């Protein structure tokens, strides 16, 4: 009945995959019916992720609740059943801005306010939070040990393991043991230093997970575990693997969730891992083979569009397509045109903002809708998917959104404040639409029959909406509303109906998108994509 | 014509007088003909010292442009010339919420905002701020040199000594070298300790000073040297002293202003201190002695009234009167009765907020009027002479002031905006009074030939004034307003005429005394008190 | 006239190649005609490597003088010309057993003996007796920052940087900097951590060298310099190469050696590392290729052999030769037979001490004597080829060295003190150490490849050739092509009915380096090649 907390934290670099491991030992234990649940804490000054750059720290995941979140919580909802909240990841910045405004509006009544007490007791009472109501709930540190930022996160959770008690809590250091070509051998030096360093930061790590592009032998586990103060069978090798879905078994196969239930007096059944056996099994027996082209302005760092690549194999999965991703410039094609088009056989257009390679976009819009290439846009790629239909058969030149030409005499997509037609006329009498919401699908539209339901629930992150006043110019002229959503009808879902598969929509489809039930769009999508193939294979 | 810093720190313990060492410091440096400043940066996470109790970290110091700062500021402005303002002292509360603030309306243009760069950034972008324009910078850091508290400062100016370069910064540490009865031996162990996690954080020290309670032996200071890096000549020894004016002159004896010019490349005279010696001349050699009650009601930290402590002994050296302080809590006043006030030659009753200990204070102002015991009241100090006053001389029964009694029918005291009178009536048509004021002297009063100047300038830190509604009735009763200020004509000091010498102040004329230059109203109080020391005494 | 100082440490792994690094940079330093010598630290107890294992330590290296050091020595030596001596090595145990010595004696006076100041000043008095007299000393600490075996060493050299001053000592930082394939990054991190541990130690490194599976960027370079106290200009990368020769050119390239004439003001030209680039091209650019076997019984950590190995390779730069390096067990020529020898273009029987796995380096040299294969043996490579000929030639049945079967009737091989006859007859430790003398028989293969009468090579070894059994062997058939001392000691044995076929009793691997070669080796090397090339056609 008490709750019990697996505090997750990482030492040598910080690109250890400490979010996948904690959502992996979370999979075992939800697989031996615990309840379990996971949170972020994220040493950075932002408030939340919403003002930051996709190429900054990769894509900002939303929560059902609508809260800007790290992409970590991708992984969490990726791999266990519990929802995540604003409540899951939470920063530095949030903490600070905390204290700032009770201190400042009197409620330490005249004390000083200090990092120890009143920043590490505002740290604590939101882990507590979090984690209220939950057998186990992992708390994964972001950051390095050893470094400023994460002092106060580590302060905390200390002090959380000695009122808690260490019946119910259990430090996880994950580490990197790097392959010499020198020696040929894995080093444990960096392990030694890291917990040597975490332990003058007062905690002695329960459980070592060892990082390194290949298995760690029995003799480097012992040796760590001879340095760092922890029985051998705590010491787990985790190695890269080609399919993160095998890195619960290889957790499990090491006992490492034995481990942690013996330690929480936990008395619960074998893991049953049949649902993870069953991903990995599909993937490694593919029937086909295609290549879809993902055309953004992001490409740089691919985490930028992570649940959305994430989606696309799990696409593959349901129909047993391998899916090989092309990452492709928008602003190559402004500059070498649809050259670099060629050989896709499906284009999808993810999300963005700002002016820039946006072009590019509309571009390949028209590219896939000419050409009958299955297409899905979502979010920009239904703005572009609309300014191109707009331009190419509704005959409304230089149609454009408010967000890159604010002035153009067609605003086919505009903040709803904005909405006016080609004349300058309005409708009679920031707006962040965040979150899970309801959306009415139409009779006889390909997601209809996708969803197989006349309502479903997905999730936004947008501004920019589609300009209702020049909507039904765009429809008289083919195109087709395909879903609507709220009391003003906003335009959720747009069709091409004369193409073999031609989708984009307003929502983020991929942040409910998992590998165990994958997606009935991006299924439907790649499913698309490997009929294009077979139909251009003769 | 470059500015130069010398960045304080402290090791080992916190109460080391890093204050008092970094202003003894510039006092030499000033006195060589330098232009030198000093500021102080606070770890803790309060905006500002204003919402904090007096009893947590002693007095809320208050600069002539209103600020509320850290008491270090008084050390700084009684022993340099230069004045301090904002700039001189800021917290990482103010760091982090200018940060959050950039941030949160864009400032960062999506970038992860970070404790390095951006936090460090906006620490580095002050100090140079309150240096610009300087010879020498003296930046004293708050906290203990290992502790999570200090580290974004630490590493600040560890980046700032990088870029400007080691020609102008300067790194001087304080540690604690304690004597052991056991070895009859002190102790360099901890000091070497200290500058390891100073270097571990970065920093190599180039001057330690060293705190005991008795002088550092050559042997011990070379051993120091030999484990630290650092010359023997820039192990400096600070004993406790009985007067902190002997400071400056202990430091140059060991020709810390030599190596610090030397370092520097300046090219200045040997520093006079001529005005240290007769401070230290006037001090040794009293001609009488006096004891002066100080009834408060923080008496249980001393610090909650280290201005006005000061400012008493620095009338004691104008008159050449050893000046005995002896602190008394409001609170016995009402408990035991006046049986405490007895064996005074002069009362002060300091400032302070609220009601907690206000009637014992009332009580001893009635004390001092009726026996003709000198009085000086501060802030509080006179609202509770004018209480008294008006209770026992104006016949207004429980006059009281709104912040203690807010609805009395004689409120005397009383924010602007509440101004009544005892039916209830008002004028005809939050605002804490900060910082440097004029203020008009009366005619033919005790501070008007004091002053020596029909107007004078003192600072406010205060929300209740007199009423000026229930005012003239008190006049009529005899009180005499002997000094005003503002539009609104706030009275600012008032006198009981038939008395040896009875005076009370809104402002606190506590933060511009200096030992060098006194001040004209404490000195006349405590040569009041001389005075009846010498009539009782037949 | 100045002796300048520079510390080379290691952090984050020991396998960093401090020993290579520390020798390329002297390489640069003395092709600017400076006087440089290099000089290894080593934290570990044994008061030499002489009671060390060869599968654990490397290869004993042997100076002239006779002492038994680390393997890096071996390094320093085909980098610089200047010769290491026992000055230029020496151990924790030795700095321990110097001053225990004295303590007990009574030189202390009765003092307290302390790690400071006693251990300490016992290392920095070695450090100054091995620099003195150069005008750049090369000091590499073993052991890896932050771990207690080495820091009586970080200590003492900190001390050193105080007294001499900062004119004239450098402290040089080796760390890691791992690529992680999660990110397509490396990582700056682990350095960032060594070196505060460095700074918590006393010690504020000058120069970054970055180790990589790759180069390490600007933008990391930069980001390392803004962390750690050190001028952009002073963080190298120094990433894996596929030949060590190249490391002397990639850290001049990078300005390394400007830095460090600028920081002890010396004035001197450009490096001329014109004899580097003709190393480089030579191996860039091999005409043919073989096959070496290398048989013996330490095959488990290829290290046990770094100079041999190193040797053939010069062989091979010197006849634009690629030489193949196959690591045979002499073991298992004991269970499979000779067929795992067949494919090779010559055989090489290295070094070695104890019985196990000797049978079959016996039966090694037989075959390689009896198909004429090019062989060389080295020390023990010399005894089973003189064993092989006792037995099957001159008809001494179970001839051996008394080392492995102390009472054979015939003690080919056996210490001076045991020399006897094969009936027991007589004439009416010794470990031979170092540099000697020999004197090389005319008409031999030998003096026709070392062109000279006599030559000196360096001996580790004690058991000799027994001169009471040897007049018989020879009447067989053996030549003795070299001879040492005044017992007129056999170094060199050679076959002549052979294409190539020379053993000897002295270690030539030590004496070899990549600029100037080995005339044995490269005679070896090239016989080898010949004996490929008819194996065609
Ligand atoms: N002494 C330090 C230095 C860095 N940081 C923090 O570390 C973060 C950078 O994290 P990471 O990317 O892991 O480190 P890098 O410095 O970029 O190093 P690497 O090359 O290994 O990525 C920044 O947010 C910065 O606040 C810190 O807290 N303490
Ligand atoms: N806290 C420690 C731990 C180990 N050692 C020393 O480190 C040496 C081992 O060096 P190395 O092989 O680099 O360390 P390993 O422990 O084997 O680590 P790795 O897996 O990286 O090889 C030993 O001689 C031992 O004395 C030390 O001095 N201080
Ligand atoms: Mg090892
Ligand atoms: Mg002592
Ligand atoms: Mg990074």
């Known amino acids: 009945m008490t709750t019990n907390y697996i505090f997750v934290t990482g030492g040598v670099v910080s690109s250890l995959g400490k979010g996948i491991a904690a959502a992996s030992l979370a999979a075992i234990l939800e697989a031996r019916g615990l309840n379990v649940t996971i949170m972020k804490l994220d040493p950075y000054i932002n408030v939340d992720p919403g003002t930051m750059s996709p190429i900054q720290h990769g894509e900002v995941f939303v929560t059902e609740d609508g809260a800007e979140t790290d992409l970590d919580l991708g992984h969490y909802e990726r791999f266990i059943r519990t929802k995540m909240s604003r409540r899951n990841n939470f920063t530095t910045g949030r903490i600070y801005s905390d204290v700032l405004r009770k201190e400042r509006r009197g409620d330490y009544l005249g004390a000083t306010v200090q990092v120890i007490p009143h920043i590490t007791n505002a740290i604590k009472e939101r882990v507590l939070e979090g984690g209220e109501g939950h057998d186990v709930v992992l708390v994964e540190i972001g950051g390095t040990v050893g470094d400023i930022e994460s002092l106060p996160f580590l302060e905390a959770i200390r002090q959380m393991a000695v009122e808690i008690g260490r019946e119910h809590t259990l430090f996880m250091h994950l580490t990197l043991v790097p392959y010499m070509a020198a020696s040929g051998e894995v080093k444990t030096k960096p392990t030694q230093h890291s917990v040597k360093e975490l332990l003058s930061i007062g905690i002695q790590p329960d459980i070592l997970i060892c990082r390194s592009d290949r298995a760690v032998p029995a003799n480097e586990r012992a040796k760590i575990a001879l340095f760092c103060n922890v029985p051998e069978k705590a010491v787990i090798s985790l190695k890269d693997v080609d399919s993160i879905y095998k ?219 589609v300009n209702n006043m020049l909507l039904k110019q765009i429809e008289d002229a083919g195109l087709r509303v395909a879903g609507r959503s709220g009391d003003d009808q906003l335009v959720e879902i747009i069709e091409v109906p004369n193409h073999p598969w031609f989708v984009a929509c307003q929502f983020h489809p991929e942040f409910t998108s998992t590998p165990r039930d994958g997606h009935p769009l991006f299924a439907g999508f790649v499913k698309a994509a490997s009929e294009f193939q077979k139909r251009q294979a003769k």
């Not at 690549?309 to 602003?331: F, T």
């Not at 000419?370 to 609309?386: D, F, K, R, S, W």
């Not at 030149?397 to 086919?412: G, R």
């Open 247 to 465: 890195i619960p078994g290889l957790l499990k196969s090491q006992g490492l969730d034995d481990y942690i239930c013996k330690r929480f007096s936990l008395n619960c059944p074998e893991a049953n891992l049949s649902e993870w056996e069953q991903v990995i099994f599909e993937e490694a027996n593919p029937v086909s083979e295609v290549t879809i082209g993902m055309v953004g302005k992001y490409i740089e760092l691919p985490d930028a569009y992570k649940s959305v690549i994430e989606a696309l194999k799990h696409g593959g999965l349901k129909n047993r397509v391998s899916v090989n991703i092309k990452l492709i410039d928008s602003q190559d094609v402004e500059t070498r045109g649809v050259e670099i088009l060629k050989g896709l056989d499906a284009i999808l257009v993810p999300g963005g903002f700002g002016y820039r390679g946006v072009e590019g976009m509309i571009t390949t819009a028209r590219f896939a809708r000419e050409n009958n290439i299955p297409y899905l846009g979502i979010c920009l790629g239904m703005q572009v998917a609309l300014i191109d239909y707009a331009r190419h058969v509704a005959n409304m030149e230089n149609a454009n959104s408010t967000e890159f030409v604010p002035d153009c005499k067609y605003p086919v997509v505009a903040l709803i404040t904005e909405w006016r037609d080609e004349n300058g006329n309005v409708e009679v009498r920031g707006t962040m639409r965040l979150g899970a919401q309801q959306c009415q699908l139409v009779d006889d539209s390909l997601v209809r029959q996708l969803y197989n339901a006349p309502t479903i629930v997905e999730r936004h992150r947008h501004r920019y909406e």
